[PDB]
Amino acid sequence: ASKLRAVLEKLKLSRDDISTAAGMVKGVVDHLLLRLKCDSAFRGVGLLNTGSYYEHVKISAPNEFDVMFKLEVPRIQLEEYSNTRAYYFVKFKRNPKENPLSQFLEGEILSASKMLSKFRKIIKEEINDIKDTDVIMKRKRGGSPAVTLLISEKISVDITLALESKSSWPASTQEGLRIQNWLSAKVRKQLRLKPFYLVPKHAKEGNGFQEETWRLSFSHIEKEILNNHGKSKTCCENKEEKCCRKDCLKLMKYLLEQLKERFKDKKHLDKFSSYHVKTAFFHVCTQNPQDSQWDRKDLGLCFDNCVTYFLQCLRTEKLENYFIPEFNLFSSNLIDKRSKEFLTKQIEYERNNEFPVFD
């Protein structure tokens, strides 16, 4: 426990670096938004307030940030891709109205590739003119042109485009977000009245990966639940209600980062991310809904409880998306058997040796 605390204290030492790089990133993205909204294809584009920094849980890599630009899209209908539950084709129910996105259709289908290509292009053009310092664009691959920026200092910013839908959440989410006994049924009702998002993400398809498919995203809900996280409305707003929920999440994230860094020459950990750890953490909150199960003085147990849960997920190769229960983040489609066995082994070693990877 003392060791765990020491690790947390240490992680605090990165806060200023990260905060300053973020404080620059906001400048770059604000400039970017300003320009992007002038394009007829994106005039309603806005910043979505989501992500590890916004959740007060970005603990390392100040050179690295994730941002989502949301784009309100006029009334859409979704068609599931196979029975993947998380991947969809986007269609407009149409309304013979002026639709600035018609130039990205494939008949009925809103092409993620064309959208991304325009997004990438405009971003490319609007950066060279200096705000702050200097900025480049890395060119990756995948099923489409994604966008990663290089704010000169090697500050890497991933930009994700996300369609916003103000309609009811898809049926695949019906049994998800099981927070009723933790955060309350009225809260679940409220959250599910909020919009949901769609990000352009190629779905796997037989040794390759095809289609202009979109994946459901609930980053805004994850942020709300992380920052308003207790059964008590005043959890963490006073000295008598300090829980260790956020610290346990930070510890799990740090465990994963440190293991990835250690084995950065093998490729076995490449497919794991803080999203897996966050998802497992949310399930553990569902399992342990009472604030008294997250007493600060119990940091040691609470952390072990997360680790154990994650291990079981790894061992069983099942980690349900917290919002889409039948979407398995650890399915063989997404993560290979060897990566999962290897992480299982390393986490077992760490747990069995008082977590050497921390010191």
Ligand SMILES: [Zn+2]
């Ligand atoms: Zn709390």
